[PDB]
Amino acid sequence: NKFQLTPVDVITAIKAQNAQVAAGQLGGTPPVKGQQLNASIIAQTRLTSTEEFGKILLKVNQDGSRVLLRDVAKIELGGENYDIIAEFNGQPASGL
Amino acid sequence: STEEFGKILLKVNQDGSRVLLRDVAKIELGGENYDIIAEFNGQPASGLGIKLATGANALDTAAAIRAELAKMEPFFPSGLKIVYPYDTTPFVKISI
Amino acid sequence: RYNGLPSMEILGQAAPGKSTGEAMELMEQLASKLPTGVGYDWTGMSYQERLSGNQAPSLYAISLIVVFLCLAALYESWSIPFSVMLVVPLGVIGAL
Amino acid sequence: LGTATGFDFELIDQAGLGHEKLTQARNQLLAEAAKHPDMLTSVRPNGLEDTPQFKIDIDQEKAQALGVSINDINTTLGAAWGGSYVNDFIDRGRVK
Amino acid sequence: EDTPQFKIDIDQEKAQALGVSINDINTTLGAAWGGSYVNDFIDRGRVKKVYVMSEAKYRMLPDDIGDWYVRAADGQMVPFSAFSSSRWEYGSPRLE
Amino acid sequence: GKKLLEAARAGRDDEVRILMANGADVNAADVVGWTPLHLAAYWGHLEIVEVLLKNGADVNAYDTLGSTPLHLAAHFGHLEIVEVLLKNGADVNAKDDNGITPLHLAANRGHLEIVEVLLKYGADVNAQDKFGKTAFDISINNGNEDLAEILQ
Amino acid sequence: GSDLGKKLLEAARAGRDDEVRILMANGADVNAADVVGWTPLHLAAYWGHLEIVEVLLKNGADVNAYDTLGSTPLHLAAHFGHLEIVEVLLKNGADVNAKDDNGITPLHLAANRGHLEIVEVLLKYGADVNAQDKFGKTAFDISINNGNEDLAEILQ
Amino acid sequence: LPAGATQERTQKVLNEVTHYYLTKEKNNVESVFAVNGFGFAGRGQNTGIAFVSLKDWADRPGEENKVEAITMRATRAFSQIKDAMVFAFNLPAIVE
Amino acid sequence: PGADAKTVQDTVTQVIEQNMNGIDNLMYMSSNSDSTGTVQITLTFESGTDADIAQVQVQNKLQLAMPLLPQEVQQQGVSVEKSSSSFLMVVGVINTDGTMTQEDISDYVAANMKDAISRTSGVGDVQLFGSQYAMRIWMNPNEL
Amino acid sequence: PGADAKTVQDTVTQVIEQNMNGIDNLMYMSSNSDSTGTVQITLTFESGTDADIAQVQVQNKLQLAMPLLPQEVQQQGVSVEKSSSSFLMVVGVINT
After folding, report:
1. N or C terminus of chain A: which is more exposed, having fewer CB within 10 Å?
2. Which residues on chain E are in Cβ contact (under 8 Å) with J18?
3. Cβ distance G75 to G131 under 8 Å?
4. Which CATH class for the G1-156 domain?
5. Does the domain formed by F1-152 have CATH 1.25.40.20?
6. d(CA F83, CA A27)
């Protein structure tokens, strides 16, 4: 609310900045005959860490100040869901 | 046709002149991809690399392929000819 | 469409006194005079008719041979079976 | 088992002929069939004949000049005249 | 073995500042250098694909990257060199 | 020269002198403008970086996007190579076509010891890239508080 | 709708010449029209049956009959590139400059399909080269929009 | 060929391979079907395959004219092709 | 299309693989993801496995993964085949009057020959050595 | 819904037909597309084919062609059924 953002803005920024883009090739087929170079173009790749997700850019202010994802949320590795908790003889456990 | 694609109207300039697709692109019939180019004894060719379904009889499937091709040949464009550069099948029949 | 190609289904029958197989052979003959690139095929009953008609002779012969072999065993004789087999028209004529 | 009377014949567009040229070839074969009443009877199409249809051309230029999107035009035409499945509702516990 | 690849970083902040959407940027890069399957058309009665892609001579060289332009929200054409940077690195062409 | 580019990449430190004893071009460049020094720096082959320099390899050779071997060593956290390259006169403030310096690359990947060595050899902390960002700007953006304070 | 009128619409469409011949002797309405306002002349013109066009015209067919959207047989013949039918209709008084409900003319239609000989025949019979459809387009506009250089040259 | 290699260089190697069979195995090979851009690996610029068909066994008298000797000679000849991996091989009795 | 190997792997291969479970008689699974934009996942079964059922089970799991795939991958068509790895035969096509190019022959084959060969019983897989035609729009950045 | 026959054929029927590969014991395939907005494609298999396997193979090839069909056709769904079965009885329900 303080930055005038919503979960919709948050979701948009993550879709945009946690992307894995197919970006084509230099010297791919059909080429100009004589081409020496054939190389993949690599653009955005998936984020891999809480640090990368945190510095996702939501917006720059009128003032030039930055609003990052870590400024409106806590970022951490955690379960897809938190519904199942197991113990083995009273001790924390997991299982199959 | 290429002609129809060429006259796709991208936009109308403020002076009313038209921007057609042929104005920003070359239009041609061409391959879905340009990676696979084949020759037969040094001349231009195409072909079908055929793999046998799991457990199917090789000799039977080959005959069936031959019979299907036979149906196509009478309707070929002039000059078109089937050739048989690589067949694992004759050796089964012949050696038996 | 038939087997992936544009098609048109045509029904008909043999004129009285004629066999469908004969009527089919004519259709094949008229078909061979159509404009370049027009083909044809038999389906449904005609498909069943054709491959069914190519067995009959082999099946009738196998029947004939086995009947004779059984009779020859029964009578311990290659010739006496003939005296039984000759009865076939005697009943068939009544049926007809 | 179906009709199982007479024959069932498929005329096939083996090249790029198209609907009209295949109709002409069909008519050609049907006329020739009719010249042999002695061998063929009731040789006829199993399908339907072409009929008048109402061709409407959207003028892209005039739409672009009026600020009318094609999607609106085409969705207006098809929803109104063809009808459109929007989504589902629940009628006394059944999805409809 | 690993080979050289052309790594390009989209500067999210610069892009937001100029008002060029990341979707436009990625479609633009991908369509030109990678090719994009748009939709289908009919070629001599057979349904086939339509591909948009850069002409060969504009996707052979690394400097070509900056010759491509995206339209910002304010309607300004912005060259790729304004919101991106690139470097050579090594990568795998076949991951097992 | 092609064999040297390959030997350099493989770390075959023995093969490298054998070819240079046969007078292979130490500044032989591949299709993207990488020299044997670029490749040794990249895959962390200290021995070969050392042998290449001693045989007159251009310490400031740049590839077709203006990136130097110091860019590569700094980016990939090869401390020793960074030191060796700086000793042999590598341009500590070298800019690639994007205006990105070795300091930028080291900062971005949190290579603290590398940043320090770069600073020692006089890297310009005020250096901006094509987007007006410094090493400091990067540290703040990345939330690297350790590095951000070192850049003070 | 006539008994023989309907039979004639079908025969003309099918190009059954001998049948049309018999139908003419018997007085089958040449002005018979189907639901969309097409006459036998319309049908013969569309499907390009030249002799039937001629027979119908000898027998009092309206050369300038228009359908429910205002199209004539000359429109159809021009559009589907039946040159000799086009010539016959013109010789028998077809309005070379007939406009359909869209303001489209036979010249428009022939140019749109790249039919040069038919365009020439139509210009020869006085086709108005400057005629505009409901969108202000001329046959010439169509030609250069279609990227047809030959056609454009013809229309200057 | 190594990843990074162009379709043009792959064609050059393919020509050397095709050449070798057409000139040095005249007595033994009936046909060569060579494919640029296809290998067991996958549709790459840097890969290809040659399908060789031999004359009938009866015309290839002696061990030096059987597939094992032919493929050894070929693989040795091709061993001297630069910057490419090229080898001929008889497929085993049962692949698997 | 246009994807590098890592993009193929992390966006397609890994997703499909993580859905490969509860498949009977599976001995092992291998895959390639290459910078052609292509992925191939091969599931190998115990001898005597019914190949029909193997295919059915593999696809039942695949369809759970399909919605999770990039739209451009779904639109290229994902396929599931049960074939030998080696070629049974290669059918070649040429033009003896030389009045058709390589491209021409390939389109002809693809457009007129390949589908009926593909539907023939016993034919596990057909590789076209060439490409079918597409409408190729070759863009010019300057004019754009 | 609301589609003419050519629309149905060229956006539904041809796409599905082109994906009917790798299915076992198929004799032939046939389809029609009409202006009630409807397509039916019938695949007929060799006598003795397990009808269940035949159906599941067809439906699985279809399942993978769905993404290629228009949205509104995906919305309606596409049914795969054994059609060579007949009615035990028909119960009419009327209101008097």
Report:
1. C
2. 47
3. no
4. mainly alpha
5. yes
6. 37
